[PDB]
């Protein structure tokens, strides 16, 4: 049989960015899995005054914001005929310029903020860290080890929004073969990643990964060492690394283009001055542990930073234990850089992410008279307030090579070959094939996860890239499982 | 409510506001059934032992299918569909380890 127990935080008053200590008590013989439970408090941006027209104010990430004068372009110079600029809410509601406390920015959490939260998890036994891991290896085992059947619930565990399916009414369609009723299927999200004026308190249930979490039979005994010796130190993310602000004000331009056809074009551009978000109050900070009442696979990880241009090779000697598989993740440091406007969207993405922008525009052509009907008399071209943004993740590696000492082993394999064929062919049912080109899998010793028996065993990671060098660097993340013996 | 909007100006002297606007909605809107939880805390009270005692609904309904059952148990999309484990692993082998 088994039951569950709670662990109160030993630190006292958790705060984001500060270390939390949890203490394992003595209540049984075996304990393997555990979950840190937090209730992050409600957040909202501060009230901000509506800007005056013709004023340029310094915005976030070194990018200047501006509210242009009438008859000018966006940059408040190079005049554009017919341009008229007003202020609107993100849902189209007018905002009067110069109003005191006129709008709020829309706070939205990170994508997978639960993995971002546990930035440094460490298991200490009077020092001497048995396992220390970070958010990047958690993202790696998300993209590889989670089966994908149990994803949405996992998306509920780490606070990621899950798409909800809706349907329109019945619609007429013609069937061509060489008249029918169909319903369109739409999808829409509601979670913390959707920008809201008032984010509700978000409940995060974060699993802890160690060598004994894989199986129930691998749980370490609690009688060999005293319970007043084991601690868990979690260094959390900053308040600026979890919630971001979305523009609560949009400069709307209406441009009238005269002649024939007479066009009215409505376009939008966000006005994003950084406001103040209230402090997140962590609530109900518990540590659920399963207690059972009656050699090993260790995530030996190391994440390093590389700055060389168009080709690189590192130096390392720490890994000595035999391995079974080898998971690689290359992330440009601009993904997690604070100067990135999309760093909350892209902190977890292994690859170079460009943005593809659909601008869904409503078009209409109206003729006022029936004599000159060749061209429309007037046209309307109305864009949406916020466009449709697709994060397109392009690979950075052109060739990968893990050069060993006496053997070359992996030598200049293509990135797509590894990243697609190796997860597809190896791993059994456990390893999901990732959607990110920078999430790579390479095999050294045997089949990754099918049985508990080693059939054989035995590392400078290097690459040739087309990515830039000192302008934007790249970091490597590993989740290779080493085989360790305890005696 | 997917609504098409259009702004038409008949003339080029007063172009500040549109002369006419069209706001046409669809006949039938787009309806999303949003399934919100009803339970705040679940508890299966046994006779001599309390067993499950005031666990949150999200904890059960999300973490228990995610962690237990092997590849057989799909994690439900409904918050009111919870899973609770009493004796052993749900479906991995034909051998009881306890009850």
């Amino acid at each position, epitope marked *: 049989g088994f039951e569950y127990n709670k662990v109160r935080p030993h630190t006292g008053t958790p705060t984001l960015g500060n270390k939390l200590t949890f203490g394992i008590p003595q209540y049984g013989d075996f304990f393997h899995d555990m979950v840190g439970h937090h209730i992050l408090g409600a957040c909202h941006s501060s009230w901000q005054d509506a800007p005056i027209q*013709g004023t340029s104010q310094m915005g976030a990430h070194g990018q200047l914001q501006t509210f242009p004068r*009438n008859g000018y372009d966006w940059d408040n110079q190079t005049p554009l005929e017919g341009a008229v600029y007003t202020l609107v809410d993100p849902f189209g509601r007018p905002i009067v310029p110069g109003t005191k406390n006129a709008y709020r920015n829309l706070v939205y959490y990170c994508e997978y903020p639960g993995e971002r939260l546990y930035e440094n998890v460490r298991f200490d036994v009077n020092g001497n860290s048995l396992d220390e891991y970070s958010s990047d290896v958690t993202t790696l085992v998300r993209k590889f080890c989670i089966p994908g059947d149990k994803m949405t619930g996992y998306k509920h565990l780490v606070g990621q929004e899950v798409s909800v399916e809706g349907t329109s009414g019945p619609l007429l369609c013609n069937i061509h073969d060489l008249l029918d009723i169909r319903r369109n299927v739409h999808y829409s999200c509601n979670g913390p990643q959707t920008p809201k004026y008032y984010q509700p308190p978000l409940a995060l249930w974060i699993k802890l990964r160690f060598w004994f979490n894989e199986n129930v039979n691998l749980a370490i005994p609690s009688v060999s060492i005293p319970f007043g010796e084991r601690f868990i130190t979690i260094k959390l993310a900053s308040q600026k690394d979890l919630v971001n602000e979305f523009p609560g004000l949009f400069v709307r331009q209406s441009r009238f283009i005269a002649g024939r056809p007479s066009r009215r074009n409505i376009r939008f551009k966000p006005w994003f001055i950084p406001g103040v978000i209230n402090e997140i109050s962590l609530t109900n900070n518990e540590l659920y542990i399963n207690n059972l009442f009656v050699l090993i696979r260790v995530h030996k990880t190391q994440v390093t930073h590389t700055n060389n241009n168009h080709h690189d090779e590192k130096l390392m000697s720490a890994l000595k234990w035999p391995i079974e598989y080898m998971f690689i993740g290359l992330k440009p440091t601009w993904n997690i850089s604070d100067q990135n406007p999309h760093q909350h969207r892209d902190w977890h993405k292994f690859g170079h992410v460009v943005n593809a922008i659909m601008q869904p525009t409503h078009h209409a052509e109206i003729s006022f008279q029936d004599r000159d009907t060749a061209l429309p008399d007037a046209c309307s071209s109305i864009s949406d307030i916020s466009p449709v943004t697709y994060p397109i993740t392009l690979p950075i590696i052109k060739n990968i090579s893990v050069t060993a000492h006496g053997i070359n082993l992996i030598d200049k394999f293509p990135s797509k070959f590894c990243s697609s064929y190796i997860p597809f062919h190896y791993g059994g049912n456990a390893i999901k094939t990732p959607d990110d080109p920078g999430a790579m899998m390479i095999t050294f010793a045997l089949k990754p996860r099918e049985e508990y028996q080693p059939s054989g065993h035995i590392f400078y990671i290097s690459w040739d890239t087309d990515y830039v060098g000192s302008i934007t660097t790249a970091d490597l993340v590993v989740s290779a499982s080493a085989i360790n013996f305890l005696l | 409510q997917p609504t098409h909007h259009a702004e038409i100006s008949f003339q080029d*002297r007063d172009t*500040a506001l549109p002369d006419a606007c069209s706001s046409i909605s669809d006949i039938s809107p787009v309806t999303y059934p949003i399934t919100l939880p009803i339970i705040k805390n679940i508890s299966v009270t046994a006779h001599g032992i309390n067993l499950i005692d005031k666990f949150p609904s999200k904890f059960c309904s999300s973490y228990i299918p995610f962690h237990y059952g092997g590849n057989a148990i799909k994690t439900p999309d409904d918050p009111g569909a919870m899973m609770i484990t009493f004796a052993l692993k749900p479906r991995e082998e034909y051998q009881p380890s306890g009850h």
Partner: antibody
Amino acid sequence: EVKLVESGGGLVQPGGSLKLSCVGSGSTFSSDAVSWVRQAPGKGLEWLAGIDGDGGGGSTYYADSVKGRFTISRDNSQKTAYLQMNSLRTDDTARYYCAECPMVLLAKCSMEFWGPGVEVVVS
Amino acid sequence: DIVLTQTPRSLSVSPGEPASISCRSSQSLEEYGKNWLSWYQQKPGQSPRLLIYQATNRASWVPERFSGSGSGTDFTLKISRVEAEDVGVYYCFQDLQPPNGFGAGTKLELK
């Protein structure tokens, strides 16, 4: 190019009323705040009145010396602004300008575009 | 309300020499992090023309000899080298809130 034309001032007895038109050709005159400004002879410039553009409202703002006596308006169909002087006294002889801020609300606007103005003499 | 006082009335500065124009306000002219004083130049026989907006910025036509005044309640326009086309009348204009006001008006003429 944004242009403004004022019309017009003339010989007016010390009891009367005037209707000054300011016609604008700038393709955004209907969304541009319009101010009326006075320069008396032997005196510096003196702000008189201001009015907003379309979008947000049509509020009018007035100098305390001529508040109630003056009536500002605008007709955007002909791209014109209007200044009505009622019961103007003998010190109202001055050069009058209409200025067109390239901005909607007249709260903190900068008077960029001007016109030649008209000289109103009161006698 | 706010009254703007121009301490210099006439300078009579030599050509090629710097000139200074002072304007003081009743209280602070600053709102939303930017000053709201403007400077206007009127040449003899010409309509008024915007010289400086927001007390530190300038129009597109402005050559590189007009300083961006100061900050707070006191401002001082400075011309580095008068080029004999700067002879005229300069005004400091309130842009905080209506009713806006003009300065006394300082006449610059060479000597």
